[PDB]
């Protein structure tokens, strides 16, 4: 725990890899019972 493990992680997944990132909220938590 001495080196920047976030700055490299910030360069990745943002500058390169063009990877979509989504929160994906806990929607199935509130599932309607459809009575």
């Amino acid at each position: 725990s001495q080196f920047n493990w976030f700055r490299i992680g910030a360069l990745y997944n943002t500058i390169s890899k063009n990877a979509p990132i989504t929160d994906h909220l806990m929607g199935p938590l509130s599932i309607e019972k459809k009575p």
Partner: protein, 285 residues
């Protein structure tokens, strides 16, 4: 060309209104390929399409038309696009991507990167990291401060960034080691960073190194080629998966490595050739 954008948006709205199943399929893809950041299989696509069609009592559309509609909706709303993947046996034994006849797909962004927005993101991440683990500490129940990253930061889950950094380090090790790296020497090289190799869980991630490598292999980040012998014993060789090949291109890898060693922009020449030499037989292109 504002009118062109407006009529394209109107056409996308008409398409999504005409095919209700397309919206549900797009939502399911955005859920699966992003929540678990895994590779979508072709076989499950037909099953989910048939199930949605039966639920909506709508005649099943053509798979190519559905794929085109999904790609158009993703590009018009989220800017994403689905690219096909080749078969792993081709490498063991300019190519236009399959798109419609590929057995696997993954969500990929298709917008050129800027020069300051990424700098802003990385600077914010560095600013938050200076206080995240200051004096060898951690946030949560360990300390009395919960909202350490102000109201909201770019750190996401405080572990996804570490996961991506470790993945980038592993890819750099595999890419630059003549596309052939052994497991023991890879562990020894990773020990230089500070990751223990005695089985203790790594910090932040709280996941053992072997389990992390297994997860990376499962997520198509690396390929465990097994050229096991006798004189020496079992042999674990790490390769580059098709997902990594699709995510990281030649120009993308050059841009990523430009800031790795902090080389000046004037000396950008004579580096792409070295990157190509280091990659070797890794890309099917």
């Amino acid at each position: 060309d504002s009118d062109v954008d407006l009529t394209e948006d109107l056409a996308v709205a008409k398409i999504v209104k005409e095919n209700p199943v397309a919206r549900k399929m797009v939502r399911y893809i955005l859920s699966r390929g992003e929540s678990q950041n895994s590779i979508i299989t072709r076989n499950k696509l037909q099953s989910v399409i048939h199930e949605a069609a039966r639920e909506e009592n709508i005649a099943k559309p053509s798979f190519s038309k559905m794929f085109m509609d999904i790609n158009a909706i993703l590009y018009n709303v989220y800017g994403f696009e689905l690219q096909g993947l080749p078969s792993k046996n081709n490498m063991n034994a300019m190519p236009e991507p399959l798109g419609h006849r590929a057995q696997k797909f993954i969500l990929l962004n298709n917008v050129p990167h800027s020069k300051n927005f990424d700098d802003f993101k990385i600077l914010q991440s560095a600013h938050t990291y200076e206080e995240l683990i200051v004096t060898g500490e951690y946030i949560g129940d360990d300390i009395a401060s919960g909202t350490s990253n102000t109201l909201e930061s770019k750190l996401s889950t405080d572990r996804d960034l570490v996961y991506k950094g470790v993945l980038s380090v592993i890819l750099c090790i595999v890419f630059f080691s003549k596309n052939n790296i052994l497991h023991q020497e890879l562990i020894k090289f990773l020990e230089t960073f500070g990751i223990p190799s005695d089985g203790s869980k790594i910090a932040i991630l709280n996941i053992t190194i072997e389990d992390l490598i297994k997860s990376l292999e499962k997520r198509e980040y690396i390929v465990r080629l097994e050229e096991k012998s006798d004189t020496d014993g079992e042999v674990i060789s790490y390769r580059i998966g098709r997902r990594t090949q699709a995510e990281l291109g030649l120009e993308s890898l050059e841009k990523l490595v430009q800031e790795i060693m902090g080389l000046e922009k004037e000396q950008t020449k004579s580096l792409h050739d070295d990157i190509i030499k280091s990659i070797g037989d890794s890309y099917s292109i």
